Design a protein around this ligand. Structure first.
Ligand SMILES: C=CC1=C(C)[C@@H](Cc2[nH]c(/C=C3N=C(/C=C4\NC(=O)[C@H](C)[C@H]4CC)C(C)=C\3CCC(=O)O)c(CCC(=O)O)c2C)NC1=O
Ligand SMILES: C=CC1=C(C)[C@@H](Cc2[nH]c(/C=C3N=C(/C=C4\NC(=O)[C@H](C)[C@H]4CC)C(C)=C\3CCC(=O)O)c(CCC(=O)O)c2C)NC1=O
Ligand SMILES: C=CC1=C(C)[C@@H](Cc2[nH]c(/C=C3N=C(/C=C4\NC(=O)[C@H](C)[C@H]4CC)C(C)=C\3CCC(=O)O)c(CCC(=O)O)c2C)NC1=O
Ligand SMILES: C=CC1=C(C)[C@@H](Cc2[nH]c(/C=C3N=C(/C=C4\NC(=O)[C@H](C)[C@H]4CC)C(C)=C\3CCC(=O)O)c(CCC(=O)O)c2C)NC1=O
Ligand SMILES: C=CC1=C(C)[C@@H](Cc2[nH]c(/C=C3N=C(/C=C4\NC(=O)[C@H](C)[C@H]4CC)C(C)=C\3CCC(=O)O)c(CCC(=O)O)c2C)NC1=O
Ligand SMILES: C=CC1=C(C)[C@@H](Cc2[nH]c(/C=C3N=C(/C=C4\NC(=O)[C@H](C)[C@H]4CC)C(C)=C\3CCC(=O)O)c(CCC(=O)O)c2C)NC1=O
Ligand SMILES: C=CC1=C(C)[C@@H](Cc2[nH]c(/C=C3N=C(/C=C4\NC(=O)[C@H](C)[C@H]4CC)C(C)=C\3CCC(=O)O)c(CCC(=O)O)c2C)NC1=O
Ligand SMILES: C=CC1=C(C)[C@@H](Cc2[nH]c(/C=C3N=C(/C=C4\NC(=O)[C@H](C)[C@H]4CC)C(C)=C\3CCC(=O)O)c(CCC(=O)O)c2C)NC1=O
Ligand SMILES: C=CC1=C(C)[C@@H](Cc2[nH]c(/C=C3N=C(/C=C4\NC(=O)[C@H](C)[C@H]4CC)C(C)=C\3CCC(=O)O)c(CCC(=O)O)c2C)NC1=O
Ligand SMILES: CCC1=C(C)/C(=C/C2=NC(=C\c3[nH]c(/C=C4\NC(=O)[C@H](C)[C@H]4CC)c(C)c3CCC(=O)O)/C(CCC(=O)O)=C2C)NC1=O
Ligand SMILES: CCC1=C(C)/C(=C/C2=NC(=C\c3[nH]c(/C=C4\NC(=O)[C@H](C)[C@H]4CC)c(C)c3CCC(=O)O)/C(CCC(=O)O)=C2C)NC1=O
Ligand SMILES: CCC1=C(C)/C(=C/C2=NC(=C\c3[nH]c(/C=C4\NC(=O)[C@H](C)[C@H]4CC)c(C)c3CCC(=O)O)/C(CCC(=O)O)=C2C)NC1=O
Ligand SMILES: CCC1=C(C)/C(=C/C2=NC(=C\c3[nH]c(/C=C4\NC(=O)[C@H](C)[C@H]4CC)c(C)c3CCC(=O)O)/C(CCC(=O)O)=C2C)NC1=O
Lengths: 285, 164, 324, 162, 172, 177, 164
């Protein structure tokens, strides 16, 4: 509502904003409920004891439980009434020793186990580093938990099989220069033309070998069958205009000791690239 | 004596193979994680006399019925053997930190324990309740470093699941 | 994982993935005084093998605490410990006293030797020891014939070898191995063909007829069938399981014959309609549409694709196809 | 299960063809009606205990012999009363399943197949369950086409019972 | 068979529960996609002959031993049965796309397909290459506009790709 | 049994492809988010005894006919085996979370578990509910939303690890069904 | 595959236990070592056609007798299968740097290899001379880094010692 630093922090509604362990009670409207609880059970005269869960306890609260605290305002009432205890009054941490029981404001009774410095209130643990704060007027003790005191009698209505089982979506990782190749194979071959063989990918270099004989994409082109009758003469040009250039002037790169030659013979099909081609450049003709 | 070294040497022996590159990689993780647990064990060494005294009072506080005549904590002599038997479990987790695995707990503290305790009529829940206390009074940036508390807690829950 | 392709392996995804990864070899003649963790692993490994992954509780494991201690200094683990554990009451209660003689005989072939009986003469050689000398020599003939020291070092645990080709067995014994060992999450109490009371290979282990191998974790992995004679002489009954022969004119008309095994037949889902039929739910005579689930068929090749659609559209699950 | 989605798949798979626009429109009409059906199912769920306690009391008012006569079939004892508020919650839950799915499928597979056989055997009267369903048709508080979708599956179960 | 709406109902009947308020809000999103799902099923079905034939054409370019004498697609009956199977898998993948659940896909196509190809000798590593070639012909046909309004369908093309990967691992 | 890295190797080996470029980035992400995975596997095996007992007890409290004469978990031999049937299932799920792949859970546990449970006569509806209770416990310890314990972690989000281990538990219910 | 993950899982499966603190300590070694061995696996996967063909004719530069009649490099098919079988081995080394162990080399390249290269009469010292040429061709600052070349060569002489 107003700023908490007005009237110092001596006001009771502004003190728990100052001692910033429970910030969820003012971020939600939970502080309206505990003011309405002590109306409803008349705790304003007699001393009592509260166990406020801290920030982090609200953050570790489960998504199958935090939904059920939103669709049921009665469930938010007794869970916050399950932290206000009227057994021992304004009890410090040294009076919470041994094993025993505690009476809540509304719910049926909750057992505590207090062993020295570790003190459990039943699915909760008092952090004792900041838990012995006592207010003099409207007098109670307040201790800090790390988990909500959730009794099992409330939460048989909740489960994870309602739909709070967490699932992540996985999406496909295709690249846009690859599925632009693959759309031309979806058309039929009378209208897709030379794009109907677009689905074949790059084989390894031994797959075009003489045991396996994988067919390249260029046999399906007409560029394999370029066998004309006509021929350039090459002697009618001016001398110096016919140019030729070898691949490498080396005996050992043109042909190794094995037959794996990239330039001479029938082993020129055994290249790791040159299996597919770019015939999505032209047309669907 | 389960360690990181002992697990890969015994698995290379089970297949009759030499130490491969998959085996020296596991010894590298023993080098990185060493500085975490070797100063937790240094912390447990010089401050064990007060940790077991704090943990020793935390089981007679929970189970106050042990001091009854006819129970396991009648006189001072049977009380002295309980602070002794919890000082042994704090020495065996000091061994598990410098080894690198659950070896010294699995041999000398856990194997054979649930038939010793059943025959000698000792409740295992009170050997539990002092182990779960020092797991709970440990806050990670004060008592040790941030990664030493992960290793120190990892053996206390291993001891708890063994007794329970 | 299922299949044969995609990993270049067939046996690990046939149910043998855990078994193809262990040695459990007990590398020292006695257990070292001071340490228990290495030898507790070997005792838990020879419990899982010799008892066939059965549950031994702590009140029953304490009944064999004596032998466990003789092994830790003064006994072998292959001999003299598996032999000692086979004479115990825990072994005898669930593997011998529950079944007939030929049922107990092939559970000892699996548990001690790691394989199956090949023919009738493997059964007959072991029943003759029991008839003349009793149970105490009956379990020694699995240890003290030639096969046991030949295939196992006398400080290793036994392992399954009835699928391998170096265990010189018939090829009908390969198919029989995958009736008695169904993956690593199974015992012979948890086997639907022997439920710690039956003879698992009764007609098939004697006559050496091969069975179709269904992988554990498949679609129709729950397929089981009964046994019944069919002839007039043995007073049999017709119409329970399909034949395994394909004899006549229907064998080669419509092409090569196959034998298809279907598993799950329910009353909801017969028609071409995506939903159950509402109304009477049963005809007069009150019988189901399929009185048994787990039906079998003998079909030609030209009738295989109409039958495949007739199975799956009516709720069935194809368990196995095998060419006759 | 009978659904506008699965009946389109089953009529194309029976003919052995691909999903044409005959089938893409039958599932388009399921998606148009789905907004009215999902508000009708969220409201019947959130007011289920009011509708369950009220509909059981509406049967004890019309047929008061069901809380009087001895025997196992009648709601005389506290055990036969608990097995009646369980039967109303079964009939109501199948209606909210049919609104979510989009057809009379979940109450075919789970409730009305075999229903006349379990009524005649355990000696239950179908007139008890009709009056329990006429109450929910008159007390769900829905309006418009939201109530048209809810009352279409309530009226479907009254036709099988009668 | 049962679709994605019937899938969560069957999971809730076996617990004996009404559906949650969170679960209705998750089925409103499945209706909110609605038209984008019907665009993918429209594009895949309308080009069904060209997807099967041009990805069979590209299979025999890379594995040309399948159509040699002694190969598994050499004869007219053995080639026509190969195109028939590639149209069967594309049919039940479009059935699984309109339903949002892969239940008709395995109960009516995939269960028993590995057992069939192992009794016949059909190479299962070559069937999965034909399945993976119809996949990227169809997930590239899914995310092109071509008379659809512009928007993000990247969550529904990860679902269509997951039905092609499911059919491919049930045969390999 | 395959881990996460050897899963993309058997996918590359099917097409004679080297692993590099596009696929190495999804595996370099596995190493970068790898400290979270060890920090989450530790959270499950630290509480592995209380998780199993609470799952079989909660299966019994909702369906108390299982401990009657005729129920499957009647005697002490049957209750101790049901407490051990679930302790193994939790063990194999924690292997698949450490590996990043569900192959060790399917090869060694789920292949054959269905016909295990139909020979013994184990009710599959009750065993699915016992797995479902373990699923809610595993997501609660990973995302630190446990109402009975508060584990210490570094700050961050681990929703992808919780949605991963939830998919392993749903394979258990789909197998034995 | 033999890896770091699959070793520590199988060791804790035969013992029948949960992943311990020493089994998580080994996967941390898989993190600190993955930077070097994924650099080598990416350098190899980009330039593999030039590394294979440079090593394929280092076989025939040492053993020119393989083109004699009856040998293994007679015709065009036999050298296509030879450059394939070298490219198979370099793919499996790329698979071993990715996984982190000798898994894919053992199950797919080494097991059964002695019985095939003797039945088909392929000289196993020539399936080695191509592997040994690549191990000495590597310049430790030029192609990869220092620790990336340690991992690259250690899988390269695992294959040499398995063929010898
Ligand atoms: C229906 C009628 C009809 C035609 C007219 C030709 C037209 C034609 N030419 C080429 C293909 C080509 N056309 C040329 C031709 C020339 N480049 C030059 O520098 C010269 C100016 C000119 C020859 C005089 C060349 C060089 C290529 C090969 C392109 C390449 O891939 O490098 C292609 C691509 C298909 C293939 O590569 O096989 C087509 C459709 N084909 C037809 O079906
Ligand atoms: C080196 C490893 C090592 C260990 C882990 C312990 C384990 C251990 N503790 C006890 C023994 C004991 N443990 C307790 C403990 C208790 N009784 C109580 O009142 C409480 C329930 C609880 C306090 C913690 C007692 C009283 C004994 C002595 C038993 C007796 O006197 O009868 C014994 C029997 C021998 C003896 O100490 O008398 C052993 C082996 N001892 C070891 O040597
Ligand atoms: C190596 C073993 C080892 C342990 C198990 C713990 C246990 C422990 N805690 C404290 C002592 C303390 N421990 C805390 C606790 C905390 N303080 C905070 O800032 C956090 C909020 C919270 C972490 C839960 C506090 C406030 C004290 C001082 C008060 C006291 O307990 O006496 C002491 C007394 C010595 C001292 O610290 O003054 C010991 C032994 N510390 C250890 O060295
Ligand atoms: C019976 C036959 C039948 C169909 C075929 C569909 C056809 C269809 N799609 C959309 C509507 C749409 N369709 C798409 C889908 C896509 N847009 C893209 O760019 C992607 C390529 C592709 C996803 C894969 C999107 C994104 C919208 C909504 C437009 C938007 O909100 O941006 C609409 C209008 C609804 C609206 O505008 O919200 C219609 C009628 N519906 C039918 O009833
Ligand atoms: C590798 C993985 C692996 C497993 C999963 C288990 C699987 C398994 N469980 C049992 C055996 C059993 N499993 C159960 C479990 C249950 N019954 C119920 O009612 C509950 C729903 C459920 C507990 C969650 C019970 C009660 C038995 C014993 C049945 C009997 O003793 O008759 C058996 C037979 C034990 C024997 O033969 O001695 C096997 C093999 N074992 C394995 O090795
Ligand atoms: C019939 C009797 C009966 C029971 C025994 C409990 C059993 C039980 N526990 C949980 C639910 C849970 N159980 C645990 C487990 C633990 N929590 C801790 O504080 C410990 C560290 C650890 C073992 C004790 C956790 C972490 C959750 C989820 C959230 C939480 O409690 O923090 C659930 C919900 C599962 C679901 O969502 O479907 C059930 C039914 N409930 C019952 O109705
Ligand atoms: C060295 C070996 C090793 C361990 C001893 C354990 C312990 C551990 N956890 C984390 C570190 C972490 N652990 C988590 C996990 C979580 N945090 C949450 O808030 C969730 C509740 C939970 C599961 C999602 C996150 C989010 C980090 C931060 C680093 C990261 O995002 O990778 C780190 C890295 C912090 C650092 O760099 O120092 C370590 C060492 N894990 C290991 O790998
Ligand atoms: C995935 C792992 C994997 C491998 C490592 C290889 C291993 C391998 N290589 C060859 C096969 C071969 N290896 C060679 C090799 C050579 N010829 C020479 O002159 C030199 C000795 C050497 C070149 C280095 C030849 C010629 C064959 C074919 C044998 C033949 O033609 O009969 C074969 C026989 C099958 C075939 O014909 O291809 C196999 C299994 N294959 C695999 O699948
Ligand atoms: C993926 C695996 C991989 C390897 C194992 C290496 C191996 C390698 N080295 C060279 C190529 C070379 N390597 C060297 C060697 C050296 N150069 C120096 O500056 C140093 C002094 C010395 C390190 C010993 C030289 C001088 C060349 C160029 C001459 C040649 O073609 O070999 C080439 C030919 C391509 C080129 O670099 O032009 C290859 C494949 N590179 C790789 O990509
Ligand atoms: C492809 C064509 C074809 C063949 C090969 C065939 C064999 C055949 N012989 C059968 C029975 C039989 N076969 C015999 C034959 C003999 N028993 C003897 O003791 C003699 C040694 C011997 C002949 C003299 C008898 C007695 C039966 C009846 C078996 C019985 O009812 O117990 C049966 C069982 C069905 C039946 O009882 O009619 C088949 C299928 N049936 C065929 O349709
Ligand atoms: C040849 C004469 C004949 C026999 C013997 C026969 C048995 C038979 N019982 C069946 C089902 C059934 N049987 C039961 C019976 C029981 N479930 C229980 O929980 C109780 C313990 C028990 C009896 C009260 C149930 C519930 C089904 C349906 C299972 C299902 O369809 O999912 C089915 C499956 C098909 C169907 O739904 O009808 C067959 C074939 N059918 C026959 O035609
Ligand atoms: C999900 C689909 C489904 C339906 C429809 C269903 C009905 C159903 N109601 C039953 C019993 C019952 N139904 C009633 C209900 C009534 N009797 C009265 O007096 C009232 C007027 C009325 C309720 C308003 C009673 C009292 C029984 C117990 C009868 C007996 O045990 O004999 C029984 C006998 C089995 C049992 O004892 O539980 C069935 C099967 N069960 C189902 O699973
Ligand atoms: C529920 C719907 C359904 C399925 C799933 C189905 C599978 C099926 N595929 C078959 C054959 C076949 N399937 C293939 C397919 C291939 N072989 C190759 O080399 C390629 C890699 C691959 C596809 C391109 C071939 C070649 C045959 C014929 C095998 C033979 O005739 O021997 C047959 C044998 C009958 C015949 O068609 O001649 C069946 C029953 N049939 C069905 O009705």
């Amino acid at each position: 509502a107003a700023k908490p630093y007005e009237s110092g922090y001596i006001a009771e509604d502004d003190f728990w904003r100052g001692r910033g362990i429970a910030a969820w009670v003012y971020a939600t409207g939970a502080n309206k409920v505990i003011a309405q609880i002590v109306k409803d059970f008349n705790l304003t005269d007699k001393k009592f004891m509260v166990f406020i869960p801290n920030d982090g306890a609200f953050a570790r609260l489960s998504p199958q439980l935090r939904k059920a605290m939103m669709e049921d305002s009665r469930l938010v009432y007794d869970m916050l009434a399950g932290h206000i205890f009227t057994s021992k009054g304004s009890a410090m941490l040294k009076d919470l020793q041994g094993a025993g029981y505690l009476q809540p404001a509304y719910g049926e009774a909750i057992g505590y186990v207090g062993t020295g410095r570790v003190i459990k209130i039943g699915n909760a643990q008092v952090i004792p580093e900041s838990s012995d704060i006592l207010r003099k007027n409207l007098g109670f003790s307040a201790h800090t938990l790390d988990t909500f005191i959730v009794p099992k009698a409330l939460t048989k209505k909740v489960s994870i099989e309602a739909g709070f089982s967490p699932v992540t979506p996985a999406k496909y990782v295709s690249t846009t220069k690859a599925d632009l190749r693959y759309v031309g194979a979806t058309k039929p071959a009378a209208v897709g033309g030379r794009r109907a063989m677009n689905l074949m990918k790059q084989q390894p270099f031994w797959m075009y070998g003489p045991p396996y004989n994988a067919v390249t994409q260029d046999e399906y082109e007409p560029i394999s069958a370029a066998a004309p009758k006509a021929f350039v003469d090459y002697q009618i040009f001016a001398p110096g205009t016919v140019k030729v250039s070898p691949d490498s002037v080396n005996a050992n790169e043109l042909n190794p000791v094995s037959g794996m030659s990239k330039y001479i013979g029938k082993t020129q099909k055994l290249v790791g690239d040159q299996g597919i081609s770019d015939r999505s450049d032209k047309l669907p003709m | 004596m389960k360690s990181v070294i002992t697990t890969v040497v015994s698995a290379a022996d089970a297949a009759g193979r030499f130490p491969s590159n998959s085996d020296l990689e596991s010894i590298q993780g023993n080098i990185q994680r060493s500085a975490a647990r070797l100063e937790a064990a240094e912390k447990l060494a010089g401050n064990h006399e007060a940790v077991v005294k704090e943990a020793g009072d935390a089981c007679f506080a929970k189970y106050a019925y042990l001091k009854n005549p006819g129970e396991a904590g009648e006189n001072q002599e049977k009380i002295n053997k309980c602070y002794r038997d919890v000082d042994h479990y704090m020495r065996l987790v000091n061994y598990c930190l410098v080894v690198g695995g659950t070896g010294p707990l699995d041999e000398w503290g856990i194997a054979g324990a649930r038939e010793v305790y059943r025959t000698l009529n000792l409740p295992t829940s009170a050997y539990v309740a002092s182990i779960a206390y020092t797991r709970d009074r440990l806050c990670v940036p004060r008592d040790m470093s941030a990664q030493a508390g992960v290793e120190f807690s990892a053996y206390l829950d291993y001891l708890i699941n063994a007794l329970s | 994982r299922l299949g044969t392709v995609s990993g270049n392996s067939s046996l690990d995804k046939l149910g043998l993935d855990k078994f193809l990864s262990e040695s459990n070899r007990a590398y020292t003649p006695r257990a070292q005084p001071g340490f228990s963790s290495e030898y507790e692993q070997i005792i838990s490994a020879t419990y899982k093998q010799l008892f066939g992954n059965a549950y031994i509780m702590d009140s029953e494991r304490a009944e064999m605490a004596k032998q466990e201690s003789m092994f830790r200094d003064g006994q072998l683990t292959l001999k003299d410990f598996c032999r000692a554990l086979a004479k115990t009451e825990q072994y005898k209660k669930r593997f011998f006293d529950s079944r007939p003689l030929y049922g107990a005989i092939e559970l000892n072939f699996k548990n001690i030797l790691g394989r199956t009986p090949d023919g009738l003469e493997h059964y007959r050689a072991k029943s003759a020891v029991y008839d003349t000398k009793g149970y105490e020599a009956f379990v020694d003939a699995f240890f003290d014939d030639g096969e046991y020291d030949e295939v196992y070092d006398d400080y290793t645990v036994p392992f399954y070898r009835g699928y391998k080709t170096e265990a010189n067995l018939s090829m009908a014994a390969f198919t029989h191995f995958f009736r008695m060992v169904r993956g690593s999450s199974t015992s012979d109490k948890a086997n639907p063909n022997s439920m710690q009371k039956d003879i698992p290979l009764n007609y098939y282990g004697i006559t050496k007829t091969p069975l179709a191998v269904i992988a554990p974790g498949a679609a129709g992995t729950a397929y089981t069938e009964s046994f019944a004679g069919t002839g007039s002489w043995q007073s049999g009954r017709a119409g329970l399981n399909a034949a395994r022969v394909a004899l006549g004119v229907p064998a080669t008309a419509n092409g090569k014959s196959f034998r298809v095994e279907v598993t799950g037949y329910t009353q909801p889902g017969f028609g071409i309609t995506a939903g159950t039929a509402v109304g009477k739910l049963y005809k007069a005579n009150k019988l189901s549409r399929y009185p048994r689930s787990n039906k079998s068929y003998v079909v030609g090749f030209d009738e295989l694709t109409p039958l495949y659609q007739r199975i799956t559209k009516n709720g069935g699950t194809i368990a196995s196809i095998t060419p006759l | 299960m009978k659904t506008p989605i699965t009946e389109a798949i089953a009529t194309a798979d029976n003919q052995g063809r691909f999903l044409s626009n005959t089938e893409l429109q039958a599932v388009n009409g399921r998606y148009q009606r789905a907004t009215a059906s999902l508000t009708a199912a969220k409201a019947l769920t959130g007011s289920a205990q009011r509708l369950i306690t009220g509909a059981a009391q509406a049967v004890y008012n019309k047929f008061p012999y069901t809380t009087q006569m001895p025997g196992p079939a009648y709601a005389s004892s506290a055990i036969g009363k608990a097995k009646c508020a369980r039967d109303i919650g079964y009939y109501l839950r199948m209606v909210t399943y049919c609104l979510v799915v989009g057809g009379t499928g979940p109450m075919d597979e789970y409730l009305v197949a075999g229903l006349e056989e379990i009524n005649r055997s355990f000696d239950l009267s179908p007139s008890w369950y009709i009056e329990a369903l006429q109450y929910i048709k008159n007390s769900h508080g829905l309006s418009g086409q939201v109530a048209n979708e809810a009352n279409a599956y309530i009226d479907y179960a009254i036709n099988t019972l009668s | 068979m049962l679709d994605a709406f019937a899938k969560v109902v069957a999971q809730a009947d076996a617990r004996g529960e009404f559906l949650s308020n969170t679960q209705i809000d998750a089925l409103s999103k499945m209706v909110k996609e609605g038209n984008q799902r019907l665009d993918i099923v429209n594009k895949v079905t309308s080009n069904a002959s060209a997807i099967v034939t041009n990805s069979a054409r590209a299979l025999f370019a890379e594995q040309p031993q399948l159509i040699q004498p002694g190969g598994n697609a050499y004869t007219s009956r053995r080639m026509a049965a190969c195109l028939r199977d590639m149209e069967i898998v594309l049919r039940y993948v479009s059935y699984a796309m309109i339903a949002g659940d892969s239940s008709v896909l395995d109960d009516r196509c995939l269960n028993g397909l590995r057992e069939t190809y192992q009794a016949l000798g059909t190479p299962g590593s070559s069937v999965a290459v034909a399945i993976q070639k119809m996949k990227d012909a169809s997930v590239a046909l899914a995310n092109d506009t071509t008379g659809t309004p512009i928007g993000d369908c990247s969550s529904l093309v990860a679902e269509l790709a997951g039905y092609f990967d499911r059919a491919a691992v049930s045969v390999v | 049994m395959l881990d996460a890295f050897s899963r993309v190797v058997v996918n590359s080996d099917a097409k004679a492809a080297y692993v590099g470029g596009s696929d190495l980035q999804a595996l370099k992400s596995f190493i970068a988010d790898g400290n979270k995975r060890l920090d989450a596997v530790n959270s499950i095996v630290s509480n592995a005894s209380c998780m199993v007992s609470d799952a079989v007890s909660g299966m019994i409290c909702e369906n108390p006919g299982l401990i009657s004469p005729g129920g499957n978990c009647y005697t002490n031999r049957r209750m101790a085996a049901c407490l051990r049937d679930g302790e193994i299932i939790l063990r194999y799920v924690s292997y698949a979370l450490l590996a990043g792949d569900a192959s060790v859970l399917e090869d060694r546990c789920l292949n054959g578990l269905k016909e295990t449970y139909i020979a013994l006569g184990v009710p599959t509806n009750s065993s699915i509910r016992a797995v479902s209770i373990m699923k809610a416990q595993a997501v609660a310890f990973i995302t630190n939303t446990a109402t009975e314990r508060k584990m210490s972690f570094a700050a961050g989000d681990c929703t992808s690890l919780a949605s991963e281990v939830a998919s392993y538990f749903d394979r258990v219910g789909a197998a034995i069904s």
